[PDB]
């Protein structure tokens, strides 16, 4: 099927582009219902939780915003009290009540019923022995549990988690012990990054804190003695933050799942809805942007294009904010349609050197490419280069047929350049060809495939369609259009399957066609299964609207061959009888 401009157009119409946007800020976790309900359950139950999602989602900002709205009972005062001159314990009193117990003791069961063991052990034998380090150490206190303590420690070192012993010259005492993140988060929330616990080697010590209440201030190797610090009942909720991959290290520890029961997973995409466009606008305004309707619409549509889905939008608020900040500079402080389009263009320019070199090499004939005419056994497939920002390029492919003993040879795979999935695609094509053409017994052909100017590894199955049509062309002696690039995976039954990076692929063929001078007949054949992924850039949409570029969507390899060879498989003088006649020719050459 031909894809009209109207079928390809995906962008949001803009009405009153320059009108200022006025919208209220959305709640924390907008469009992230799964993660929000997980966190609500963790808050309601006192459970430890982990926030999981790809980088640049805004996971940290959403979490701190949501925790800021919570309310708990005012946290107890928290202190170290000495039970001896070599031993300390962590104590909670009701709030504000340690400043009284400090004055009392500075009177060198009075009404501090919980502070007993400190006082009991505070008894006598200075008078009994003339024996010449003893007053309580307040770690924390606060006025209200609204908002609760919220401690985000990105740097999960033992001293930052557990506190430190200072040494006043050597000795030490209760009064020289500094609190850590764990102490500051009591009655509230400690937030840590999974990657920092791994990188800092503090995961085992952290588990000992949560499982056993072992919280040991960091000491030093010199100090001729230390204090014993008694374990204490931990009163805190821990929320870990990280990527799926940051967690996988931790997840192989059975203790991880035991301690962190509540998974709060962010979706990498939201529905592309009016409500999520509106929420994005209110979010950008709350960040301080001066947003026009046109600037909101373009950012919203760039989020859809980022997701490579007409119906979804990229959920990475941090990535949308960074693009908006570059737009705001190009707009002199105003976030407009133009400033967004021009920020996108300047990103591509700043990463274009590789493509400028490639396009110059094609123009000079140093890379041999055809974008017009016809040739047997040759096709432009499409690839993306595996370095950000993943530019697409045509990849010239040849198929040559000789009389032989049913061999399909991938030259790139035999030379070691082709990966396992690339190999799988060649095997799959072999299975299709052998089973499709059985009249002579096993295929009377040896077919060799080569990516002609490929010096580097190729992986993926998306050149399967180009490889199969090249192969059929070589068998039947079928001239194929070189003005249409081909992308698609094939199954053993000859059906065309979805491929990745379809926008980069299409745009990369358009870019080469344009650099060599558009003929008016160039285009791409791609999988019908990718229609929902097509969010093509303005310049390609306008070329298709102008009749200067053409998109074809297919379901079968044979539908692709019919377009490339300019004929039907049947209505015979069709391609199928030419393919059969080529196989009969090869079979005769192969026997006597």
């Amino acid at each position: 099927m031909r894809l009209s401009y109207e079928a390809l157009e995906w962008r949001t119409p803009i009405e009153n582009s320059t009108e200022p946007v006025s919208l209220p800020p959305p709640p924390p976790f907008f469009g992230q219902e799964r993660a929000r309900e997980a966190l609500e359950l963790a808050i309601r139950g006192g459970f430890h939780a982990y926030l999981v999602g790809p980088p640049s989602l805004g996971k940290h900002e959403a979490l701190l915003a949501y925790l800021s709205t919570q309310s708990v009972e005012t946290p107890p005062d928290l202190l170290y009290v000495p039970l001896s001159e070599r031993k300390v314990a962590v104590l909670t009193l009701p709030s504000g009540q340690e400043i009284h117990l400090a004055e009392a003791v500075e009177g060198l069961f009075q009404r501090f019923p919980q502070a007993r063991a400190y006082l009991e052990a505070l008894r006598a034998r200075y008078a009994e022995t003339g024996e010449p380090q003893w007053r309580p150490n307040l770690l924390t206190s606060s006025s209200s549990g609204t908002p609760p303590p919220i401690v985000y420690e990105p740097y999960a070192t033992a001293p930052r988690l557990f506190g430190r012993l200072d040494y006043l010259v050597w000795s030490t005492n209760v009064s020289l012990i500094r609190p850590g993140a764990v102490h500051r988060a009591q009655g509230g929330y400690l937030i840590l990054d999974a990657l920092s616990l791994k990188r800092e080697g503090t995961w085992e010590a952290f588990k000992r804190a949560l499982r056993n209440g072992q919280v040991e201030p960091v000491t030093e190797p010199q100090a001729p003695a230390g204090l014993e610090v008694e374990p204490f009942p931990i009163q805190m909720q821990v929320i870990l933050v990280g990527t799926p991959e940051a967690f996988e290290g931790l997840e192989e520890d059975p203790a991880f799942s035991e301690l962190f029961r509540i998974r709060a997973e962010f979706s990498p995409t939201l529905p592309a809805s009016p409500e999520n466009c509106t929420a994005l606008g209110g979010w950008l305004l709350a960040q301080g942007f001066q947003l026009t309707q046109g600037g909101l619409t373009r950012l919203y549509d760039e989020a859809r294009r980022m997701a490579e889905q007409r119906d979804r939008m990229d959920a990475r608020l941090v990535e949308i904010r960074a693009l908006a900040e570059e737009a705001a500079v190009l707009g002199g402080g105003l976030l407009t349609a133009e400033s967004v389009e021009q920020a996108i263009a300047a990103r591509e320019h700043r990463s274009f050197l590789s493509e400028e070199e490639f396009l110059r090499a094609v123009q000079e004939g140093v890379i041999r490419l055809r974008t017009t005419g016809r040739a047997v056994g040759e096709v432009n497939s499409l690839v993306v280069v595996e370095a950000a920002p993943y530019w697409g390029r045509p990849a010239r492919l040849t198929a040559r047929a000789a009389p032989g003993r049913d061999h399909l040879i991938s030259i790139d795979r035999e030379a070691g350049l082709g990966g396992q999935i690339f190999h799988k695609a060649v095997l799959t094509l072999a299975g299709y060809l052998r089973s499709r053409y059985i009249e002579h017994g096993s295929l009377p052909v040896t077919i060799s495939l080569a990516f002609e100017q490929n010096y580097v590894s190729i992986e993926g199955d998306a050149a399967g369609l180009a490889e199969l049509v090249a192969a059929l062309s070589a068998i039947g002696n079928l001239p194929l259009r070189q003005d249409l690039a081909v992308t698609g995976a094939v199954d053993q039954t000859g059906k065309v399957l979805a491929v990745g990076a379809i926008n980069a692929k299409v745009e990369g063929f358009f870019r080469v066609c344009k650099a060599l001078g558009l003929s008016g007949t160039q285009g791409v054949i791609l999988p019908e299964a990718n229609l929902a992924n097509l969010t093509l850039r303005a310049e390609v949409l306008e070329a298709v609207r102008a009749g200067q570029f053409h998109i074809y969507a297919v379901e079968t390899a044979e539908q692709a061959l019919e377009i490339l060879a300019g004929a039907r498989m049947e209505g015979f003088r069709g391609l199928q009888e030419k393919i059969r006649a080529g196989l009969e020719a090869f079979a005769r050459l192969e026997e006597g």
Partner: peptide, 4 residues
């Protein structure tokens, strides 16, 4: 490296 390229990717199809």
């Amino acid at each position: 490296a390229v990717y199809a």
